[PDB]
Amino acid sequence: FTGLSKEELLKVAGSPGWVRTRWALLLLFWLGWLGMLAGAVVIIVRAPRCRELPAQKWWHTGALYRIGDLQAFQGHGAGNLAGLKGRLDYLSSLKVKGLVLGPIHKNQKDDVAQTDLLQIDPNFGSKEDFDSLLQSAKKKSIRVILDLTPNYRGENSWFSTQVDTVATKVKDALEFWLQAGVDGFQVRDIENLKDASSFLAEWQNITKGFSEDRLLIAGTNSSDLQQILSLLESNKDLLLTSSYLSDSGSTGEHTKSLVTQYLNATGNRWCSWSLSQARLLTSFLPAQLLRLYQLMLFTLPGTPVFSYGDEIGLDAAALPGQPMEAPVMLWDESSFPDIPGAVSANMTVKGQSEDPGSLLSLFRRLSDQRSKERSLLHGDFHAFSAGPGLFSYIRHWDQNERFLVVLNFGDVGLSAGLQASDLPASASLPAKADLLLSTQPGREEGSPLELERLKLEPHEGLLLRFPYA
Amino acid sequence: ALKKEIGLLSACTIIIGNIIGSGIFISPKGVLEHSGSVGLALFVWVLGGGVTALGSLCYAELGVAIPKSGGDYAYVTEIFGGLAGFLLLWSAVLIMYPTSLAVISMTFSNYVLQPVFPNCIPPTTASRVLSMACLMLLTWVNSSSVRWATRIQDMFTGGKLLALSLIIGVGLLQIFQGHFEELRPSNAFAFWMTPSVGHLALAFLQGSFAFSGWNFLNYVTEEMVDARKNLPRAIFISIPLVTFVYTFTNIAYFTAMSPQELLSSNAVAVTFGEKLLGYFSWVMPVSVALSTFGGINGYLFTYSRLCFSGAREGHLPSLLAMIHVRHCTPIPALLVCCGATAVIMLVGDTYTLINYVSFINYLCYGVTILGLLLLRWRRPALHRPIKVNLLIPVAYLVFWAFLLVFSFISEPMVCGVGVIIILTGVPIFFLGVFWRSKPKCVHRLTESMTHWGQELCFVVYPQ
Numbered sequence: 001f002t003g004l005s006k007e008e009l010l011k012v013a014g015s016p017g018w019v020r021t022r023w024a025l026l027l028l029f030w031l032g033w034l035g036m037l038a039g040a041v042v043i044i045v046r047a048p049r050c051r052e053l054p055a056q057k058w059w060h061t062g063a064l065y066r067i068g069d070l071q072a073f074q075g076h077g078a079g080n081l082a083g084l085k086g087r088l089d090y091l092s093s094l095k096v097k098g099l100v101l102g103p104i105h106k107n108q109k110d111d112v113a114q115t116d117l118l119q120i121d122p123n124f125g126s127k128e129d130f131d132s133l134l135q136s137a138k139k140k141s142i143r144v145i146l147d148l149t150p151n152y153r154g155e156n157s158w159f160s161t162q163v164d165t166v167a168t169k170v171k172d173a174l175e176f177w178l179q180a181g182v183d184g185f186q187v188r189d190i191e192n193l194k195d196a197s198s199f200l201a202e203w204q205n206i207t208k209g210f211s212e213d214r215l216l217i218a219g220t221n222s223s224d225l226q227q228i229l230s231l232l233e234s235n236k237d238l239l240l241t242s243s244y245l246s247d248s249g250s251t252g253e254h255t256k257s258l259v260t261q262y263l264n265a266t267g268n269r270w271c272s273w274s275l276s277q278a279r280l281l282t283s284f285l286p287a288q289l290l291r292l293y294q295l296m297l298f299t300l301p302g303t304p305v306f307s308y309g310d311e312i313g314l315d316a317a318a319l320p321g322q323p324m325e326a327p328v329m330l331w332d333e334s335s336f337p338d339i340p341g342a343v344s345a346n347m348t349v350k351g352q353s354e355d356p357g358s359l360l361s362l363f364r365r366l367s368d369q370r371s372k373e374r375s376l377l378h379g380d381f382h383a384f385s386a387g388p389g390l391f392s393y394i395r396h397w398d399q400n401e402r403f404l405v406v407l408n409f410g411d412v413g414l415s416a417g418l419q420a421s422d423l424p425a426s427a428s429l430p431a432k433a434d435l436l437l438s439t440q441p442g443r444e445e446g447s448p449l450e451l452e453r454l455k456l457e458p459h460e461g462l463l464l465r466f467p468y469a
Numbered sequence: 470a471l472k473k474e475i476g477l478l479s480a481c482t483i484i485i486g487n488i489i490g491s492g493i494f495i496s497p498k499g500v501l502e503h504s505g506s507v508g509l510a511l512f513v514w515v516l517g518g519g520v521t522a523l524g525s526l527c528y529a530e531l532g533v534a535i536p537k538s539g540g541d542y543a544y545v546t547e548i549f550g551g552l553a554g555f556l557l558l559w560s561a562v563l564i565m566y567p568t569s570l571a572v573i574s575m576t577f578s579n580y581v582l583q584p585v586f587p588n589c590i591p592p593t594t595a596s597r598v599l600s601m602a603c604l605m606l607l608t609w610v611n612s613s614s615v616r617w618a619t620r621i622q623d624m625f626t627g628g629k630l631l632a633l634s635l636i637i638g639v640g641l642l643q644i645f646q647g648h649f650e651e652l653r654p655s656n657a658f659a660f661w662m663t664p665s666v667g668h669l670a671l672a673f674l675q676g677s678f679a680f681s682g683w684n685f686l687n688y689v690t691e692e693m694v695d696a697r698k699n700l701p702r703a704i705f706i707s708i709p710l711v712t713f714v715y716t717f718t719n720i721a722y723f724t725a726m727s728p729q730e731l732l733s734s735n736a737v738a739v740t741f742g743e744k745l746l747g748y749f750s751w752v753m754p755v756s757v758a759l760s761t762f763g764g765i766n767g768y769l770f771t772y773s774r775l776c777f778s779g780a781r782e783g784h785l786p787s788l789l790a791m792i793h794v795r796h797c798t799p800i801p802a803l804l805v806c807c808g809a810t811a812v813i814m815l816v817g818d819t820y821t822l823i824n825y826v827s828f829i830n831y832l833c834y835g836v837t838i839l840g841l842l843l844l845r846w847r848r849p850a851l852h853r854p855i856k857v858n859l860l861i862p863v864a865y866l867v868f869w870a871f872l873l874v875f876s877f878i879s880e881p882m883v884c885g886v887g888v889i890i891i892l893t894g895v896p897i898f899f900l901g902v903f904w905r906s907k908p909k910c911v912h913r914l915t916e917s918m919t920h921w922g923q924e925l926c927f928v929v930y931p932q
């Protein structure tokens with residue numbers, strides 16, 4: 001039609017001059033395709049490899065939730081394991097990865113003759129109530145860690161008698177409890193146990209013998225670094241919770257010195273961050289620093305350990321007539337019969353789950369971030385110099401979303417004063433970075449903020465986030 | 470004549486290969502994002518199949534009514550005139566097809582390098598080069614012959630069927646293994662909702678992308694033996710199998726793990742394979758690449774037959790619609806499609822362009838349904854050996870209207886830009902066809918270029 005015809009083409013395209021060009025062009029295409037395929041393999045080979053995951057355990061992936069007094073956790077009505085069964089929904093909402101149950105064995109007094117570890121107190125339920133909790137917890141991916149300290153109703157944690165009988169009954173206790181199905185153990189106040197290093201080695205030996213995913217935690221009241229490192233010379237997978245981070249915090253420089261000097265001393269092993277073995281944060285900090293500290297413990301390289309009520313800022317100093325060793329959790333304003341009417345709208349769990357400005361909302365947002373990003377889970381931690389009273393550090397694993405946390409512990413506002421030439425070139429801070437959340441509400445989120453002229457407010461923490469560069 | 474050798478099995482394999490592509494390995498995350506719940510996400514996958522079946526019935530009736538080639542475009546051209554037909558051809562050639570081809574090729578390249586870097590993303594240049602290499606190989610094998618293309622399509626359809634059957638069996642084995650804690654009516658609706666608007670618009674518009682391409686068999690006609698019987702049979706057979714495969718594949722995707730793990734992982738298939746097989750899990754991702762390699766061909770086989778039939782009627786430059794003596798294949802048409810797919814590749818992140826193609830292949834599906842409805846009344850004397858009961862075009866029309874209105878409110882900027890892009894082809898129409906008796910400088914140049922391409926590619930013009 002518009003073009004030439006078949007006969008005209010055959011007369012003009014059958015002669016030499018066209019059959020050569022199309023054959024030459026066909027060869028050129030085939031050479032190019034192989035040239036592209038060879039070029040791709042060159043680029044693939046001359047490319048950096050991707051780093052390998054470190055095969056995390058079940059306690060590397062989130063915080064732990066210590067509960068001391070099961071009776072006071074619910075208050076009245078329910079005071080056994082069956083009472084806790086209905087409250088696992090709240091803990092699952094908190095995105096915790098473990099439960100350090102309080103002692104449950106029948107302990108009467110300092111008499112060791114009838115103090116045994118292999119049966120549960122009648123007030124806490126029985127075996128069928130205990131075991132039903134474990135599998136129900138598994139259905140929610142919640143691990144249960146059983147505490148066992150032979151003397152908790154008295155002033156001495158391990159009696160004033162010898163240590164032979166308590167050790168052998170504790171050894172028999174584990175053999176029973178691993179068969180029961182518990183996912184770990186905890187012992188508190190080991191400084192009252194003679195030569196605790198040897199027994200801890202045996203307990204770690206036996207517990208890890210049953211399985212590789214088991215845990216053992218030890219608690220101490222000492223804050224001296226040399227004393228703390230004394231127990232870790234013979235154990236490598238030991239979680240030690242102590243008062244090292246406590247007894248200070250009025251200045252950010254002291255915390256920076258405490259954290260940095262601890263990590264290089266232990267060689268950047270896996271550690272646990274907690275202000276005390278069995279007491280809340282409010283016993284060591286003013287009411288204005290709970291938001292800042294909960295930001296620090298959820299980004300430091302370890303396994304944060306919290307007591308019950310620390311997500312709502314529960315404090316016994318704001319309510320008269322509350323024992324320091326067993327405060328009652330405030331489900332609502334009717335949970336404390338004594339001096340009624342003093343409980344406000346922000347001192348209840350239900351009074352903070354709908355306000356995106358309360359501690360519980362901040363706890364849940366931080367908890368989700370910790371158990372989601374690879375940088376927070378198993379990323380390297382590097383801290384750099386900053387202004388006076390400023391603590392700043394960066395988390396970065398291989399190439400994932402880098403995080404930047406800046407904390408100002410001072411009571412006066414100042415500039416961040418961030419500087420370069422002190423970080424590895426893999427994750428050098430860029431000119432601008434996104435902001436995820438801030439301790440003090442009032443700022444925007446998602447906008448790329450500048451770091452050269454960044455300003456800070458008293459008792460404020462920032463959680464920035466910048467991409468691979 | 471081009472050829473008449475495509476049997477029932479070949480047409481059925483064409484439909485399956487066009488439907489089963491990169492959608493099933495990419496969509497299930499997104500449909501689980503906006504829906505929020507497993508049940509509501511499965512609702513989209515089970516209702517899109519019904520909507521596609523209704524459209525397929527309507528298209529089968531319309532295609533047996535009008536035997537002209539180039540379906541979806543001949544019907545509109547005949548009914549609404551030249552202008553609507555040219556607009557549909559312009560949108561299909563420039564928007565629907567190259568974007569789908571680019572997405573399919575990029576998915577192939579990204580999933581074929583998964584074992585090499587199974588903790589991060591591969592370099593972009595290597596992915597682009599691999600995708601261009603497979604595009605060039607497939608366009609060459611399409612320009613070489615048609616029997617080879619059909620055989621390749623059949624083998625790759627068998628391969629996709631085998632891979633999907635293996636996935637369905639692995640997911641099913643948990644009924645005997647007792648791992649059905651998900652989809653348990655106890656948990657069932659694990660989540661309720663979060664917004665208070667029509668966010669389901671961009672969940673249907675993103676889940677009905679694995680269903681794209683069910684109308685493409687109508688493009689390859691005048692190459693089908695006994696089109697009056699084989700085409701409706703293939704259309705009626707293909708869709709139920711696709712729906713049954715897709716629903717159960719989604720069931721297996723949500724049964725082996727938690728919704729969050731789809732909401733974080735970018736390798737939806739790879740996570741399933743590595744969890745339910747552990748070692749020897751390298752088999753499934755390669756098959757996925759194999760699966761995706763069955764899509765590109767199924768596109769280039771039909772795309773070339775569209776731009777062919779779109780140039781005989783003068784809506785496209787005369788240099789196309791070329792027939793090559795010694796194994797007739799539309800060589801310059803195939804080169805044009807390959808190049809058009811390649812130019813898109815210079816712009817990345819076309820996974821955000823799924824909304825583009827999914828909007829456009831709703832507009833030019835409602836338009837054809839409206840054309841069928843108009844022709845049902847205006848010309849009732851046509852011979853229709855296979856007839857569809859009414860109310861199917863009406864139901865598809867009301868659903869179409871609802872999806873358009875609710876998808877034009879959520880994100881208006883990109884949809885408006887796309888509408889402007891498809892509408893600015895009218896000046897091209899006026900300059901090309903409506904304007905005639907041009908100066909000799911136009912005809913002489915056009916004839917010289919056509920003759921040069923003719924001598925280069927060794928073709929003949931059917932006319």
Ligand SMILES: *[C@@H]1O[C@H](CO)[C@@H](O[C@@H]2O[C@H](CO)[C@@H](O)[C@H](O)[C@H]2NC(C)=O)[C@H](O)[C@H]1NC(C)=O
Binds near residue numbers: 191192222
């Ligand atoms: C940490 O615990 C140790 C051990 O209980 C405490 O050491 C006691 O110190 C008092 C004060 O001189 C002595 O009377 C006791 O005899 C010590 N205990 C033992 C077992 O010898 C130490 O005071 C505690 N530190 C803090 C800050 O509470």
Ligand SMILES: *[C@@H]1O[C@H](CO)[C@@H](O)[C@H](O)[C@H]1NC(C)=O
Binds near residue numbers: 201202205
């Ligand atoms: C630890 O257990 C192993 C396994 O039997 C044993 O050989 C070793 O002596 C144990 N060490 C201690 C300190 O109990």
Ligand SMILES: *[C@@H]1O[C@H](CO)[C@@H](O)[C@H](O)[C@H]1NC(C)=O
Binds near residue numbers: 260264265
């Ligand atoms: C930790 O202590 C060692 C030993 O003195 C020292 O070389 C190292 O620099 C310290 N770590 C840091 C971060 O300074």
Ligand SMILES: *[C@@H]1O[C@H](CO)[C@@H](O)[C@H](O)[C@H]1NC(C)=O
Binds near residue numbers: 344345347
């Ligand atoms: C929190 O409770 C205290 C206690 O009375 C009250 O003074 C304060 O206004 C409350 N804050 C908000 C935001 O309701």
